[PDB]
Structure 1
């Protein structure tokens, strides 16, 4: 703690020079004649004119529910933590305001260090061979602020791993490079991990508008879509939770099948013991789901802490497919579904190093993905593959044509009727738990009686029954879909009408999933 430590400046007055002036020249108010789209382009998604005009010691509103402030933490018994902030070409104002925010709002007793990881930035203000603005300014901050560099941009996993391997505290908390904290953001995480070292605890994320920089209030539980990305519990999925967990208290810690932002705190030893990150994940993407799956299956738990809140400025290669293939290692027989949803790709997912993580999985004794679905994410639409009874073409023999979803990538999300070619654009799947008829390449798109695709919702407005006669019956209206006239229209159900009889391939996937060759 430097000179001037008090409430709102727990590490002292930051960024002040020997003569007493701040070490950072704040910009004047943004021009009155400033076009936002250009300003956002110049700022890489941020309003830099405004950010550069705001103070690094910026007050933020307490986003915590009032009840969170009725809690006490004994800082002498909590374990120290190491805050890690990775950044690639983060502008000075947002990076240092993130640092100031943490230092000002984190007691020195529980903050071992603050590690800034430069993941190969190229801006002149950061470079080793640049103008030295950043390094010079760090000299005006507590010595517990460190800077470490990657000479080449590694990506999410590589840069975080370097920061984690460099942290000395028993707990590390990973943040973003464009954040502001609510008060007492860290104390909840430390207390929860001290009581059980196997818990990875995520703060809840509020928002900072990228144009106005207004502070905005942010759920908790996250599922995943078969496109292999996290997705919040929809209304119909929280309705499947036990009644005690549907509407949880704001102070309650709540479990989550999946992580999103990448902001979390963990016991360093347990993190490495449970696999850390798969350091073959390239650039960015999906490392949060592989972590979430592996964590739960190998003895960990993932929790969200609503009394721990961080503001996040939301913005306005061939590695992405690889990252998904490697994540499918942890999905056992369900990878067949995931693999078909992302287009049956055949990439070089680096099989040699993935065998090693498979051998690691057994040696550790991790549980199965079926166990994960039945015990961690039983509210999902697909808990067993038996929940997807049809996958293939929806074909009307009478006219000799198939349902064509190629238009889901067109403004008019109209489903069509075309000669069958067997490609993915003519392949549909059925989720029986919700009656959804979707194309295999998007489980967020659902067939409507309008003959159009729209965003799936777990309601009666998307429920279809596939009858034993072959009819697609919209349950709400009890009408059936007909291909009469090469047009999609709803009609009275009548199993003698061949224009409303469809064939749909049953989905009987193998007991285990074999990876495609390279």
Structure 2
């Protein structure tokens, strides 16, 4: 234990929570974690938490190998305020397996999951439990602050950042949008409805966890965190929030795709194609049996992935409605726009349509944007270069009007059209005054 400053939002410091919040059993799994780091977490939990709110602390050793973790730990553990137990996985298991085990061992009404490398803030627990007490079907996440791995210095995380995800099914941090600000009328001290969760840290009602099917043990153990429990909670009646008054620190192929297929085949209905279409060959990855989970979904009678995009994640990166999902082919040159695997702020290229999806996959969305995953085609000056920028959902320079009859794609702000590449810059589309050539005619086809 060391100290920190109060990183909570001014208003949080005054809030009073009802009496008799439930008791929680923090569950932490570890693997060869350094001694100091592991105990800094343990101590932060006891010192920063009101004793009558903590049941016990369960430390799940995931088949470590380091000497100090064995008897010294147990020794050191049994001697202190809060009861701390040390469960041991016989032969390497994985986070899911370890959390499942340490959870079946806990006895608190609400289970809190943390990593072996975290540090709790002042006032972190009360707001979490208070939320769950208001509604048992609410899963809660504290704001995740940053601890350096080198210096270990502290940097608080913002209440204006929440969980989303991209076409590749990767979890990602995204800015809280207006709707969430309008809904809370500006009071940032009110919890945020996050479309997804980092998976790292969260608290949940003991009985609610079991009720929505805990975790999918069919996923391979070297996988890790997933969007899976996030889609599950929402589509199946629950509510997932980031309690902005709670802060907690954290120090910062085939396997990955197996879990993506498992969660995508089970929850994303037809939107799973956004992931498949841009990952040619991921279809050869064997993802195991999902019958059980498919059973669970029908048992709980969860709502469609579409219900989730329009109600819970309107500012999603995967479009709920789209005019096309495929290649954008120039009718004159028969070349296709393609991201060339480049990153945000980079020039979108153009090359002969190979007709094999992937990097030549684009979507002209209902929001009139020409996007590929989380990037959108952006123009800022006449004849300027058309680059791929992070999609802000505000149109403007990322607004393109398509004419399905005339086949044009004009950039609204500049008042020009898109056509074949010019010379000297032979490998990129261009934006020029609208002529009417077959060169400014594009075919937005659907796979």
TM-score where L is the length of structure 2: 0.88
Which of the numbers 322, 328, 335 marks the counterpart of 2:258? 322
- In 2, distance between residues paired with 1:334 and 1:133? 50
Aligned pairs (5 A) from 1:22-421: 57-73=1-17, 77-126=20-69, 128=70, 132-142=71-81, 144-218=83-157, 219-234=160-175, 238-241=177-180, 243-245=182-184, 248-283=186-221, 285=223, 287-314=225-252, 318-328=254-264, 329-343=266-280, 345-352=282-289, 354-380=290-316, 382=318, 384=320, 387-408=321-342, 413-421=346-354
- In 1, distance between residues paired with 2:316 and 2:387? 25
In the TM superposition, what is the alpha-carbon distance from 1:369 to its structure 2 partner? 1.5
- In 2, distance between residues paired with 1:265 and 1:289? 16
* Matching of residue 477 in structure 1 with residue 414 in structure 2: yes
SS in 2 for 1:288: coil
Aligned pairs (5 A) from 1:463-474: 463-468=399-404, 469-474=406-411
1:214-265 deviation digits (Å, cap 9, x = unpaired): 2212125433222213334447xx13557333x6423312322211142111
Of 363-372 and 396-405, deviating more is: 396-405
Call closer, same or farther: CA 1:367–1:506 in 2, change over 3 Å.
same
SS in 2 for 1:183: coil
Aligned pairs (5 A) from 1:503-514: 503-506=443-446
In the TM superposition, what is the alpha-carbon distance from 1:106 to its structure 2 partner? 1.4
Of 177-186 and 250-259, deviating more is: 250-259
- In 2, distance between residues paired with 1:490 and 1:471? 12
In the TM superposition, what is the alpha-carbon distance from 1:383 to its structure 2 partner? 5.4
Higher strand share: 2
The root-mean-square deviation of aligned C-alpha atoms, in Å, is 2.6
In the TM superposition, what is the alpha-carbon distance from 1:398 to its structure 2 partner? 2.1
Call closer, same or farther: CA 1:197–1:401 in 2, change over 3 Å.
closer
1:430 alignment counterpart: 363
1:274-312 deviation digits (Å, cap 9, x = unpaired): 111111122355753111111112221112211111122
TM-score where L is the length of structure 1: 0.77
Of 327-336 and 139-148, deviating more is: 139-148
8 Å Cα contact 2:377-2:386 kept in structure 1 = no
8 Å Cα contact 1:68-1:250 kept in structure 2 = no
- Where do 4+ consecutive residues of structure 1 move more than 6 Å? none
8 Å Cα contact 1:402-1:426 kept in structure 2 = no
1:135-172 deviation digits (Å, cap 9, x = unpaired): 33324434611111113332221121111111111111
8 Å Cα contact 1:402-1:417 kept in structure 2 = yes
* Matching of residue 498 in structure 1 with residue 438 in structure 2: yes
SS in 1 for 2:342: helix
1:365-401 deviation digits (Å, cap 9, x = unpaired): 22222222232223335553xx221222222232333
In the TM superposition, what is the alpha-carbon distance from 1:412 to its structure 2 partner? 9.6
- In 2, distance between residues paired with 1:418 and 1:437? 17
8 Å Cα contact 1:382-1:433 kept in structure 2 = no
- In 1, distance between residues paired with 2:17 and 2:337? 60
8 Å Cα contact 1:179-1:312 kept in structure 2 = yes
Call closer, same or farther: CA 1:271–1:66 in 2, change over 3 Å.
same
- In 1, distance between residues paired with 2:244 and 2:444? 45
In the TM superposition, what is the alpha-carbon distance from 1:266 to its structure 2 partner? 0.8
SS in 1 for 2:41: helix
- In 1, distance between residues paired with 2:221 and 2:145? 26
In the TM superposition, what is the alpha-carbon distance from 1:62 to its structure 2 partner? 1.3
In the TM superposition, what is the alpha-carbon distance from 1:184 to its structure 2 partner? 2.2
SS in 1 for 2:92: coil
* Matching of residue 443 in structure 1 with residue 374 in structure 2: yes
- In 2, distance between residues paired with 1:365 and 1:426? 36
1:15 alignment counterpart: none
8 Å Cα contact 1:193-1:266 kept in structure 2 = yes
Call closer, same or farther: CA 1:260–1:359 in 2, change over 3 Å.
same
1:51 alignment counterpart: none
8 Å Cα contact 1:321-1:347 kept in structure 2 = no
- In 2, distance between residues paired with 1:407 and 1:105? 45
Call closer, same or farther: CA 1:434–1:232 in 2, change over 3 Å.
farther
SS in 2 for 1:389: strand
Q: For this pair of structures, how many residues does the alignment match? A: 434
- In 1, distance between residues paired with 2:42 and 2:191? 27
- In 1, distance between residues paired with 2:331 and 2:16? 69
Call closer, same or farther: CA 1:211–1:341 in 2, change over 3 Å.
same
